[PDB]
Amino acid sequence: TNVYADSFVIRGDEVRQIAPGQTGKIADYNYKLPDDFTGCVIAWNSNNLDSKVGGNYNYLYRLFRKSNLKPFERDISTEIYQAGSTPCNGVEGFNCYFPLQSYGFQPTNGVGYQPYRVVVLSFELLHAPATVCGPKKSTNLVKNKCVNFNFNGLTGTGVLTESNKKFLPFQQFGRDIADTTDAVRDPQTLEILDIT
């Protein structure tokens, strides 16, 4: 379950920090991952349209924080940093050091400073299954020969032929008496069959 994914852009040098139990600058001040962070991580390049005219300052990051980030914590906070004992009243004095200095996405550098179309697949588990899963390739059918079959949960082996028995909009199963499964309307053609 929990296919919460994020769609954002990350500079090329800070890429590996999206990792289970990693530190750095993003993983210290911008985006924290917990221990045992399994799943997947994927990034690829978003070079040549992530450069607005002379300095891509639409896109920010927090450069300073008092203490450690909690995992899964979004730092939307206008609470700027304080270094010394004199608190900042908005006027940039000597110990403010405004943490939201922005991304330097000006790709005139090498490959290490490039904007990348990154995603962070964050996977965890709660109590409700049958979430996002995979389309398991949906093979063909066969008739009039004994054959193994696996259907959507139930399975068996036999020959598949036509039928006279009828269904309703809800059935996925069929047995004549005493758990002897014999009837499947197929999940693709929606056509009723027998299992001899």
């Epitope: 040549n48 607005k52 002379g54």
Partner: antibody, heavy 123, light 109 residues
């Protein structure tokens, strides 16, 4: 339609000044750099200038510095090119050169062109 | 250096392939990978055909192709059509935009 329409061309005398411009439509002009690339009639291509949205970063060519001044207005999606101390080698068809949105092409390359206007510095 | 070295004209039979050099310097061509190719019809604006020597933008046919080794780019147009007959320009950006000398492709008819 992504579209760039030059303005400010004409026929001027050497020693005088002129101001060109270019209006943008069809694309968010505040997110991509526009340039000036000049071409004399029947000759090669020659870049002039570039302006940033904050108005701080501007780069000029070697035959450009000290005379030509580019600026832009992100709100009106137009720009300006203030030009003083005009010489007859500056006689060229002037193109406001930017990039459209649909391309992966960045702003330092040259995809979205203008139709051009003629500036003649002659006595 | 100041102007990128190109052949002044390249003559080719229609349907064939031509190779047009863009000779620059190490501070112009071999420094980065940012070399362009520009087709300019007479009486019209230029038009982009090649970025980053390997690949092509949208709308550009696959007849346009490039190759770069060292300090010389090489635009290769296979299958010459009569609509390719125009002026050709290569440009590089390491710190500044340096254009080429100009190349008039002549489609022999």
């Amino acid at each position: 339609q992504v579209q760039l329409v030059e303005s400010g061309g004409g026929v001027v005398q050497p020693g005088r000044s002129l101001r060109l411009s270019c209006a943008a439509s069809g694309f968010t002009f505040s997110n991509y750099a526009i340039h000036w690339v000049r071409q004399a009639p029947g000759k090669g291509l020659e870049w002039v200038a570039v302006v940033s949205y904050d108005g701080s970063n501007k780069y000029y060519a070697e035959s450009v510095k000290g005379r030509f001044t580019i600026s832009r207005d992100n709100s009106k999606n137009t720009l300006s090119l203030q030009m003083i101390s005009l010489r007859p080698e500056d006689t060229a068809v002037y193109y406001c050169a930017s990039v459209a949105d649909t391309a992966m092409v960045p702003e330092w390359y040259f995809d979205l062109w203008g139709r051009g206007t003629l500036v003649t510095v002659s006595s | 250096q100041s102007v990128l070295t190109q052949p002044r004209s390249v003559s080719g039979s229609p349907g064939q392939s031509v190779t047009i050099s863009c000779t620059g310097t190490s501070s112009d061509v071999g420094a980065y990978n940012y070399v362009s190719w520009y087709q300019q019809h007479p009486g019209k604006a230029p038009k982009l055909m090649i970025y980053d020597v390997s690949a092509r933008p949208s709308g550009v046919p696959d007849r346009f192709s490039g190759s770069k080794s060292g300090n010389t780019a090489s635009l290769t147009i296979s299958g010459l059509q009569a609509e390719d007959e125009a002026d050709y320009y290569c440009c590089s950006y390491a710190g500044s935009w340096v254009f080429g000398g100009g190349t008039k492709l002549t489609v022999l008819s």
